[PDB]
Coordinates of C-alpha atoms and ligand atoms in Angstrom, one line a residue:
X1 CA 2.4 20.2 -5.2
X2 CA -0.5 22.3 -4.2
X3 CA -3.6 24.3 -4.7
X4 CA -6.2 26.6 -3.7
X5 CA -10.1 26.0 -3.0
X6 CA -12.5 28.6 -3.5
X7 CA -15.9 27.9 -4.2
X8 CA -16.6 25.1 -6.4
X9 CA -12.7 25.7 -8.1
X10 CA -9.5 23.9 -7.5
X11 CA -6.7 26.6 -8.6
X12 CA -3.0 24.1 -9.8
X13 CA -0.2 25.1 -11.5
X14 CA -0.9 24.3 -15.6
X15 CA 2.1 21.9 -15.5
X16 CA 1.1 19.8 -12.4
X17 CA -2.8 19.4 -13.4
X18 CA -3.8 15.6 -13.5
X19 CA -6.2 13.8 -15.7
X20 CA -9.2 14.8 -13.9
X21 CA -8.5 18.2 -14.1
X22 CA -8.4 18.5 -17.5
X23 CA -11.7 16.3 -17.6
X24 CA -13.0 18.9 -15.2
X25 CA -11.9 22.2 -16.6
X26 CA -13.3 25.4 -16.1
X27 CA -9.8 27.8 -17.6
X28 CA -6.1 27.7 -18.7
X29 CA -3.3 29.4 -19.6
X30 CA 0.0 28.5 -20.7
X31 CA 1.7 31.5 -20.7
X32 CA 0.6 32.0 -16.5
X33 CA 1.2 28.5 -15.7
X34 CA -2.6 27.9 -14.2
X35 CA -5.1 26.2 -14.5
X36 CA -8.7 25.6 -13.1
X37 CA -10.9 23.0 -12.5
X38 CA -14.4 22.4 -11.1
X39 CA -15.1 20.7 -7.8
X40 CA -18.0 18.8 -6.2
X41 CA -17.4 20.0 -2.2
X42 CA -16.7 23.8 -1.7
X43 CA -13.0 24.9 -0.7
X44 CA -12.7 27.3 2.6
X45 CA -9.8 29.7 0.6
X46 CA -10.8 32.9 0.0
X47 CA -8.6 35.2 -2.7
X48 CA -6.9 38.9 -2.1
X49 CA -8.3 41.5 -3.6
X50 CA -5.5 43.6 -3.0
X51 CA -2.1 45.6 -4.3
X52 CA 0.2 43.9 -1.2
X53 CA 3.8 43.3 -1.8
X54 CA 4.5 41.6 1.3
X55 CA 3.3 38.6 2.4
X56 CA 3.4 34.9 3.6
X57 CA 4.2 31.6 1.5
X58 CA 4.6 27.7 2.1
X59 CA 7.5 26.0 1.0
X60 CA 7.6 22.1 1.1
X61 CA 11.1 21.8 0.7
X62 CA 11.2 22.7 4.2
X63 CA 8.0 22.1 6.0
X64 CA 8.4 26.0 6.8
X65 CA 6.5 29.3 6.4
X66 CA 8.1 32.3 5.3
X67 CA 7.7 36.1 4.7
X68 CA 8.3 37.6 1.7
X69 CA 8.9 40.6 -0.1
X70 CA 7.7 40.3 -3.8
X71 CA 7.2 42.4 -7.0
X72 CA 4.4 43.3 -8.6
X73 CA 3.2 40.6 -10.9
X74 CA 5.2 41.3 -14.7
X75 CA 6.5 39.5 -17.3
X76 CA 9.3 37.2 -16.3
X77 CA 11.8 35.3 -18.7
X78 CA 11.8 31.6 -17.4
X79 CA 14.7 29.2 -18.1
X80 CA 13.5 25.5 -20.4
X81 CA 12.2 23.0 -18.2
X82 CA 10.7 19.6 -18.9
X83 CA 7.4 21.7 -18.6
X84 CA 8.3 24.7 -21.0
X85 CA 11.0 25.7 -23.4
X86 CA 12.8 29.3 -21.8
X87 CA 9.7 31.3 -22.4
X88 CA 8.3 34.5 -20.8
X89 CA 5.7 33.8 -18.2
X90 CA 3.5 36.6 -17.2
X91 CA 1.3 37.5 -14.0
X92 CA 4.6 36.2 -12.1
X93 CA 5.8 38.0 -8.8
X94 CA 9.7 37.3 -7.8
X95 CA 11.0 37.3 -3.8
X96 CA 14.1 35.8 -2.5
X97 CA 13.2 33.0 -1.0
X98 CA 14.2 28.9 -0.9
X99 CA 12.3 27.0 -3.6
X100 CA 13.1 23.7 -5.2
X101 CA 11.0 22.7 -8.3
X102 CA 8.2 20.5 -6.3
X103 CA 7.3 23.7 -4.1
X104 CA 5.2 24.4 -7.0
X105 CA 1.4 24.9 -5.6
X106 CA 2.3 26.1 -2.2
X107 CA 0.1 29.6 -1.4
X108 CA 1.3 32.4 -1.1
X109 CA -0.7 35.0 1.3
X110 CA -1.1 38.2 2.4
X111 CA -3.2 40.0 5.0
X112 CA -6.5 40.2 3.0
X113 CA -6.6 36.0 1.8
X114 CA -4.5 34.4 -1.2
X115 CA -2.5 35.9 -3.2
X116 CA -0.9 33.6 -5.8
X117 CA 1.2 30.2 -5.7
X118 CA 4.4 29.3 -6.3
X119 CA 5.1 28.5 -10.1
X120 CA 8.7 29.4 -10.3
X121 CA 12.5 29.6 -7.9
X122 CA 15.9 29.9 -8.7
X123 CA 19.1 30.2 -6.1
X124 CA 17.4 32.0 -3.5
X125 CA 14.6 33.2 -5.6
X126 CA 10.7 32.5 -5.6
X127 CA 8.1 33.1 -8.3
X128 CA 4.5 33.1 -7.8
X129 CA 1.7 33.0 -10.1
X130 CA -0.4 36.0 -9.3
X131 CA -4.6 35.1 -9.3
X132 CA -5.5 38.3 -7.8
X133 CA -6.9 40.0 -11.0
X134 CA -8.8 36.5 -11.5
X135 CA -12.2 38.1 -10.5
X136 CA -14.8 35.6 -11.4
X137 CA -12.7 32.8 -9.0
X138 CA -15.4 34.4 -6.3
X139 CA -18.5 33.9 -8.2
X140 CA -21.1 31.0 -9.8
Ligands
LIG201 C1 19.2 27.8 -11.1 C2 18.7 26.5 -10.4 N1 17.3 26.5 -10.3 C3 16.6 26.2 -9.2 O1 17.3 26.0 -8.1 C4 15.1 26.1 -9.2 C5 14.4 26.4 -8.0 C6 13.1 26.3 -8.0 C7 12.3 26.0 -9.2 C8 13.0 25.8 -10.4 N2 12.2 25.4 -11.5 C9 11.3 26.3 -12.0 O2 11.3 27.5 -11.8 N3 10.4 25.7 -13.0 C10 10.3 24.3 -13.2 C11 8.8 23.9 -13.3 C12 8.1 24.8 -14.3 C13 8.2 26.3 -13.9 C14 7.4 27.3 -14.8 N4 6.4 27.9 -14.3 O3 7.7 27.4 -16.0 C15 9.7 26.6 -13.9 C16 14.4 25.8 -10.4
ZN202 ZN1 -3.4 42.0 0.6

């Protein structure tokens, strides 16, 4: 679990957003696994705006975190969940790095603010949901 706050928005991954998300919601998309909703009390995160490929991110499975190399984001095949069917997921950013399937939300940052969250793993592998092309997530 996890999510970013910046501004009035609350950043979750699609698959994770509760009931009052979706009562309070500001954008989605499926095929990025992300979605945003409005908040009453303004959030202290501020976003990258930025081409890094190195950076930090928080993994829950082990109360740890770690730095990470990580590609630029793409489109990524994504093996069937209970979420999705095996789809491909795009604005997604790969590292090796220990994730489990609840490390979902955890941020993932770089020098200039946040970069993304975790969306995706595999054995030994990360995947992060790239926001940084999100622009109006600083604004209104
Ligand atoms: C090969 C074993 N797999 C793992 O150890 C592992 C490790 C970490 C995570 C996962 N699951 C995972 O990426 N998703 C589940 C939730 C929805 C996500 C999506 N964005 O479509 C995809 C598997
Ligand atoms: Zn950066």
């Amino acid at each position: 679990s996890g999510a970013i706050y910046v501004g009035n928005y609350r950043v979750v991954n699609r698959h994770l957003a509760t009931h009052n998300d979706w009562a309070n919601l500001v954008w989605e998309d499926s095929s990025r696994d992300l979605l945003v909703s409005s908040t009453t009390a303004q959030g202290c995160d501020t976003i990258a705006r930025c081409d890094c490929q190195t950076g930090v991110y928080y993994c829950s499975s082990r109360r740890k975190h770690y730095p990470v190399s990580f590609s630029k984001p793409s489109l990524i095949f994504v093996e069937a969940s209970e979420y999705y069917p095996a789809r491909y997921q795009s604005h997604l950013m790969l590292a090796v790095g220990h994730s489990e399937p609840g490390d979902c939300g955890g941020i993932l940052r770089c020098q200039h603010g946040v970069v993304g969250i975790v969306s995706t793993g595999g054995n030994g592998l990360v995947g992060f949901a790239d926001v940084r092309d999100l622009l109006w997530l600083d604004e209104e």
